[model samples]
Target chain A: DEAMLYAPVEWHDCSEGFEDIRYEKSTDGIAKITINRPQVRNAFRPLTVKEMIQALADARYDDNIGVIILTGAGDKAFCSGGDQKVVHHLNVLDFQRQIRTCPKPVVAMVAGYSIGGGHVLHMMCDLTIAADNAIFGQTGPKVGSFDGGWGASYMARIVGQKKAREIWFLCRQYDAKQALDMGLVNTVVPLADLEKETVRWCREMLQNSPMALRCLKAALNADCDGQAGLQELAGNATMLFYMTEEGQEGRNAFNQKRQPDFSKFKRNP
Target chain B: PDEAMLYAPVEWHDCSEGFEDIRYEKSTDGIAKITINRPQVRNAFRPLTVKEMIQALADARYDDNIGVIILTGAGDKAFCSGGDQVHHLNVLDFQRQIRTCPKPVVAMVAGYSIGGGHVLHMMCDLTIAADNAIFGQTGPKVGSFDGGWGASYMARIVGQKKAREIWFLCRQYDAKQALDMGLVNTVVPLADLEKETVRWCREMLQNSPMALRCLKAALNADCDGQAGLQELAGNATMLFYMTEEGQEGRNARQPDFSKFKRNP
Candidate 1:
């Protein structure tokens, strides 16, 4: 039995348990999922994957929950992509599927070391809010491993080919400023303000009609290459998300309170 | 008078499939043909305008649809002027820039290239205008929604300096004056206009599509603030600005091809 070991950084307090992940939930229906095993720099473990998948499912079923925020257990690393030393224990196929299946928009709030597996997690999210102190790279090949295929669309759509080539071929982590400038991130907040800014953006989403939220998200998530372009606000767009009673309840609850009684909101008339 | 454009006898080809206003006619041998049907509303492109035009061009690219597409108005007063403002803000905001056809598109003008008209014109690969064709954004002034694609393209088309001048002035430019300023490729007699425009398009069709598309996309990208080419330059600038190479280059001054020129 190979026992995981510990290596700590100044900003982090991580552990070696193959089951390390920390978590929290927000004022709204937002779920805060954290990777706690910081000792191995809070790197990915079987336990971390299981927890996140469960959290996503839970959030999905619970009408009370509106959004999910995925963060690291500790500051050191969201997860140094799958335990490098303990790699032989796990197979790769299952892991890739886990990252892709999360239904709701998950934001990767990276504080530090968003490398390898953590990098994949970050990409899986619909959005990112990274800390300035965080560094990124896909150094798998050096250790004789490979990266997933999901990053290409993310690359072409966000940063464009030039910088994507630089990141892929060079395998160097870009500073948060560089990432922000390249348009990979919606915006970058300082280390101190990262939490606040991300929360603010999330709140903007939560405040809208659930229908508007889903429609807006799906529209952005769906295809985006046409001349007339899709109607800015068409029936196809406004139906799914806005149609929900949660969307209406969320809207009506805006000035009243952050904690929505999702149960009170009717599913449909 | 619109007559200066019309029965001034500019080569007018009836471009409309139905009784539409837009007309398409070419004067030069596959080099020059003009779209000049709409004399009523000064050739302002309406619903499904550019898309149909683009598809037609794509089809034409293969057949005798004429090589280089130069879009202009039938009436002299306005060259393919913006969308119909008379109907603007009425719910159905006009949609242009659909299929621009297979050929390289150019906007040739005189009078009002103002308001939504300029936006349609900018979708083309090049712009030609009489001194009278003033370039500015009226959508903002008229209270309509716009992504302002031209905001980015204007900078690329005219470069930062001239682009700012016209955009800031947000006014008109005369024929001879616009030509001198390079806003219009060249100014010609209302008579020689067809001749000059055809000459330009003929040159474009002669090149292969692969080369043309890549070159145009790249050139457009080179001018975009967020484009990779710009990012590459920015990355270099930040790294080099305080370094020895930068200081020396700065010292070298005028003779250095161009300080802003793309470095191969």
Candidate 2:
């Protein structure tokens, strides 16, 4: 009855013909971005990151889109990190920032392996919904590489410092249940219910106040992102201020070449 | 080497005078334990309870011997059921005091941690819960709400969806569920709650005091806006003042600062 009560989300490709990724949006204001390299367990190349960045940017700017889901193509993997054979740069960090600052909620629809840099990508998203078969870990140190940035600090924020250190130092994989326990993921459902559960969460988020969600995300990041976080939080305040007659009076005065009257506005307690 | 053998045992002494609603004690091992003394109504705080807590928190914050502060309830039934039916925004003041306190405050939660009590645990730097601990927000259900750190910081801890669910649905989560959501740091058996809490405090006490202070401020900075920045920046300034370079500015003399080694 519940399933029949709601309209089915039919995803239409909005990729503009990108090769490394598929960008799709549903009628329900949900945008889904999938890494299309499942043969390599969805390992991202530089091209993959570039395409993702563009899709994320497009989703972020699109007024119709309320939530974005980041996932991989196949059942075997959400992502396996950078393609080892073509590992030329760490441009994924740029994509991570894009997810971090995106005004809309970005949910990581995780299945299979989310390892190394791929793990960091999921961590950067606002929320993570894991499949029962999902496996998560960091492989950076074992491969003579590491992300000490948000990959470390933000992970530490999500999990605790001790656990984050253990994850990086040991480089062990955790099942979905372990990830949920560590707060690395929001929830875990059966692998078959991964997309359904992810969409459920996305729909729930879409129902809440977008401004509240945006400010909340920024506030959460502000605690770790330093001054950049502060700017994002404060920028929300500026946006709200612009909506008020009090904020508009100043702008109106400047344009109309007249002194603004401030006597009418009451200072809130 | 056995880590347990590295520290001495803690013996607590009642340190405050004329506190009716709460019990405040300090240990020689640099720990302060504050317990809400109202268990009959599930450890609910009254105006007096809040005032006493603010006083105790201020005392522990200023005492140089106190490194870690533990906030808990008087009985096994609850950490705090929240404010007594009689309440005010003074609870906000108590929340602010907890946030601004330089020392690390740990919440030792046992049974029900509901309503404002849930927010109290969230404000604490760390929460150690007993296996019987239960957590939830009762604000929306009772025609009350905490839109401040209670909502936003909660979102920080348990993400947006779960946090929203807790507030919206007003459903209780057990210790294991709380642990799963990152609502509490860790859960221990009721029998070992105090011991485990003390062990955690002792571990933190062994670290650099200044480093801990700066770290706490840094952690709070992101969510606290400009006030948070002020706390973090103040710690930076204090650290700088300990250096010869900083003292040189106060001494009104231009002298060679090359003796100080540069750090990476």
Candidate 3:
């Protein structure tokens, strides 16, 4: 009935090791970064955050990787947010910062409970695809902890201001349908189809132009990050410029101890 | 999709007398409409066309009774193809006109919202596309670009990668593709396009004008940098002026802005 752009999922390599998380990559350039702490309902503590950050770093630098799927180990919870018993806001903040600055695209493959910080993490991703049984809401006010940065400002952007206020104030759990209606998640699939669907999206992304993806990622965060966002966006432009012979000429002339030749490139319309 | 699309009885404004490329309609039902009539070139705008649109939008902005503005192109083939062949840069001012206008602006796209046309639609508060509508950008391909609101602001709505892909690849997307990428809000059958747009207009008309203004300005505030902040602050000041405390040498207790801060 519709155009078939989604790629088929093929079984591939799974990595071993790591106590708090599972890190795996496919031959097709898709990296699955799973938070395996179902015993705490996937709630992240300091160690969990550390492990996730390490995994994210590995994915960020991996030349073969194009997309990263951030999810909880099991279906019960994508992430319940911070584990209050083991408080480490700095580590969590570091994770959020790195995810934003990561050049590769990250998709939140959500299933089950995505509450509080977990919900914020999903929001921070480039895109979110929720499973049919996924539920989303904020618990900061209800639990005496809150994330004002993206949790409020960016949340206001996702869902409109009034709806965001309602989400934070009412502390109501919205089903996947409601979340989709409010623009909280991009699209949803059956619980069993979550990974398969995410794999399809990842493969689609893997086929696209890489420089465009990097520029796009930086451009997306440009508004919220203020001057920093502009820097990242410009950084992409600079990187692109450096690849051109025009920019390389200046560098080559300096190294060769010679006057620069600049007459070749045309300033075209 | 079976229902016939409804169009308001379109009438011309006094300013539309000298114009041949566009039509302006001020509805008694609280709608102001601008129709790009150059369908021969796929409804593309030149210098004259954009200037006419700017004047019509300005007229709508001043008419307090007009609570919403609808921009569309004549015929079923296209909404807008792109800017003029040369020196049509006044389109920038035309874009600002839509953003700063107090009333909500909706783009009723039928087909071929391309290049600058795509940027214009993105500037609107909302978008409703016909099933056959096609949206895309041709800047990088055509050797022109709009970094201001077109690139950065677009990323805010559809995310980074999709925005870059639209610009870099310059691929034409169907209405369904546009909607999936969050480029457009909703789509309806081509036969029911106007009816769906008018329904949305009526729904928006039900809202308090002041509240809508605040919301639009607030949303714009995020992407606009200092200018955005000024617009948002301007709305707050306008609201203050309506209160007795802010009027006629009256003294009111200073409001604490910190109470609104949600700190962790």
Per-residue alpha-carbon lDDT of model 1 for A140-249, expressed as tens digits? 43344434244433444455433433344335566778667556666677787766666666666676676555555546644432222254335455555576666677
When 2 and 3 are scored with DockQ, the better candidate is 2
List residue ranges in candidate 2 displaced over 4 A. Answer: A1-153, A160-180, A183-269, B1-3, B6-9, B253-264
The candidates' DockQ values read 0.02, 0.04, 0.03
lDDT of 3 by residue, B163-221 (tens): 88988898999999887767777789999898878867765665457656665665666
Q: Kindly indicate the candidate among 1 and 3 with the higher TM-score.
A: 3
User: How far off is residue A254 in model 2, in Å?
Assistant: 35
Evaluated with TM-score, which candidate comes out highest? Answer: 2
Q: What is the TM-score of chain A in candidate 1?
A: 0.70
Best-to-worst lDDT order: 2, 3, 1
lDDT of 2 at B229: 79
> In model 3, where do residues sit more than 4 Å from their true spots?
A1-153, A156-175, A181-269, B1-15, B248-264
Tens digits of per-residue lDDT for model 3, A1-269:
11333545444545456778888887678888888889888998888888888889988888988899999988899998888786255578889888989999999999999998899899989899999999999876556545655666688678743355446543558899989977999999999989878877777787788788998889888857888899898889899999999989999999999999999889879
Question: What shift in Å separates residue B85 of candidate 1 from its native position after superposition?
Answer: 44
Q: Model 3 residue A22 lDDT? A: 83
Give per-residue lDDT, candidate 3, residue A4. Answer: 38
